[PDB]
Amino acid sequence: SHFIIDPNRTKLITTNITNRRPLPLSRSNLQRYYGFAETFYYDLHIFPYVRQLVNILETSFNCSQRGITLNASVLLHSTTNNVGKATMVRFASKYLGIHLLEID
Amino acid sequence: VSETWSLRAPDKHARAKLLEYFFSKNQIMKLNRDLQFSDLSLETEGFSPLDLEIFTEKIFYDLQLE
Ligand SMILES: Nc1ncnc2c1ncn2[C@@H]1O[C@H](COP(=O)(O)OP(=O)(O)OP(=O)(O)O)[C@@H](O)[C@H]1O
Secondary structure, three states, rough: OOOOOOOOOOOOOOOOOHHHHHHHOHHOOHHHHHOOOOOOOOOOHHHHHHHHHHHHHHHHHHHHHHOOOOOOEEEOOOOOOOOOOOHHHHHHHHHOOOOOOOOO | OOOOOOOOOOOOOHHHHHHHHHHHOOOOOOOOOOOHHHHHHHHOOOOOOHHHHHHHHHHHHHHHOO
16 A cells, blocks of 8 residues: 655656645644744634634535535725735635635 | 616515525525515615625525524
8 A cells, every 4th residue: 555656766757637625724734834924813703804704615615515506705895905805815715724816 | 769668676575576586596595484575575675686686695694604
């Protein structure tokens, strides 16, 4: 079942791409382990807006898994810049272990 | 154009029927016995059918939260 790979003896071939869900932040903090710019960890109990928005993604994800399709979309707006709405988007994405598709 | 036709905002009875059907579409929904569609329409005046769509989906989500 197991095996060893040696560059001088073992050959490797890249193949087509395969989907796989990313780990939720609960099981590990990849940024912290790799020492990247760790994204600020919200305490949902103290950030009600973040909680409300999160209360969307997992429900959509479950209903999809439960065979229920529903186009869940949401738009962030604010009265002042520099509030990290994108930061909270990333935080929510990592929280549920969901792939992120950011387009500036 | 000889004559024309205009789609004014839906009426309360229209709203009762439309809300019932929209709930039906996501048949997974259910409602309390006391809550009746006719009663429901009385407080949803001046809403476009798409508005009722989004409102029912929002309600479905709200139920999912709890
Ligand atoms: N609690 C926090 N909320 C928001 N941003 C935070 C927080 N803690 C740190 N930051 C940092 O602040 C920055 C937020 O920038 P971001 O682009 O997400 O803001 P924004 O609200 O979308 O604003 P704008 O589009 O007006 O620049 C990031 O560099 C992020 O790391």
